[PDB]
Amino acid sequence: EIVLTQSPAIMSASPGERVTMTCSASSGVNYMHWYQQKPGTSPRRWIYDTSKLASGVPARFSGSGSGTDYSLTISSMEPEDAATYYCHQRGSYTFGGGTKLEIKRTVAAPSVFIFPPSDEQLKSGTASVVCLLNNFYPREAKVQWKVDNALQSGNSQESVTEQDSKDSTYSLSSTLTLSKADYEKHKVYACEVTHQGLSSPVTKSFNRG
């Protein structure tokens, strides 16, 4: 009956920068609560009744709103504030989509590594090819699998770590899953990596044998 739409979905904020995220309702409401959830942990009450700060919430956190537009404000962004914030209220049937607030840092292009399937895995009927993208920022990246220059689709699964504690970067591993018969049919396997820190795509490849 009352839909909550948060904006924006993802936020990159440097240390000390001002941070403002918004939560809009499809109809008028009296108040709005905000919840904090970090990866692996349960959500916590953070700002209730529009502007009341829950216990332990730093003074740099601010709540405000009226009618259909509510907001959460951080006057000086700190690295401990990196989390996902959800807005909600009894009047709404479910939570907002959330706003993932990440720590902003300098651009670091990914380091690309390729790994052929092991010999003992080839002894079965499966050949996994793994492409590693190590310590890059921002998150946005594109990994293409090329085997004999044929563009692959629907046969690769990706996994991305959370933002690193020390250097605030991301890591990504893409696994190409192909049978042993299809693997030895072709010769050259490659992953093509594109990222805003790379003016030219980085390609890592190998040949069987």
Binding site: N30, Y35, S42, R45, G97, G98, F113, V130, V160
Partner: protein
């Protein structure tokens, strides 16, 4: 102090049902509405419903009518949610959260959540394969075909920790989890010292060590 104790994890077969428990302590159970919140992997918070423990009045999210049924036991101060006709998309972390009184003070205490996995696979140990390396170089181990979560990966009995990345475990079309753990080492060390990944799978009591050679 307020505590909302939930069991950590449960593996349930598709088609069956499961009754999740939320045992409270530190306050009068009938004084606060209890909420339940679904969080599918990698997704946001979804609100299931609420129950008043005083008379068991319930209000549900429209999309969970007939899927989840909230109940209460006052005698043990415990709230329950029964999810029935389980399918793969019911795999989620399910939270119970206490509603404040007055209600406009939000959900102040949350449980740790029960990680529910809906799968038909049986407890199976992982297969570990080397990610052979080829200034700085990367090597690792491919931990494949295990159930259920999780596995722990160590490098050289815990001596090699810097530069290590243990990625989140993806789920394959076979119903088994697959995980990669990588580590960057100087190229000069290749061929000299040995690199061994220590994979431990608690549910199946399986421990696997694999040497990674170029």
């Amino acid at each position: 102090q307020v505590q909302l104790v939930q069991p950590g994890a449960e593996v349930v077969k598709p088609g069956a049902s499961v009754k999740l428990s939320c045992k409270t302590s530190g306050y009068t159970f009938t004084s606060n509405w209890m909420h339940w919140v679904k969080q599918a992997p990698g997704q946001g918070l979804e609100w299931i419903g609420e129950i008043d423990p005083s008379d068991s009045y319930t209000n549900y999210n429209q999309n969970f009518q007939g899927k989840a049924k909230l109940t209460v036991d006052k005698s043990t101060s415990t709230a329950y949610m029964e999810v029935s006709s389980l399918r793969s998309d019911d795999t989620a972390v399910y939270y119970c959260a206490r509603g404040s009184n007055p209600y406009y003070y939000a959900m102040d205490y949350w449980g740790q959540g029960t990680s529910v996995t809906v799968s038909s696979a049986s407890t199976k140990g992982p297969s570990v394969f080397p990610l052979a390396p080829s200034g700085t170089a990367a090597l690792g181990c491919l931990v494949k075909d295990y159930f259920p979560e999780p596995v722990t990966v160590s490098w050289n009995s815990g001596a090699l920790t810097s530069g290590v990345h243990t990625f989140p475990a993806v789920l394959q079309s076979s119903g088994l989890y697959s995980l990669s753990s990588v580590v960057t080492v100087p190229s000069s060390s290749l061929g000299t010292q040995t690199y061994i990944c220590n994979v431990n799978h608690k549910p199946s009591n399986t421990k696997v060590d694999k040497k990674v050679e170029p």
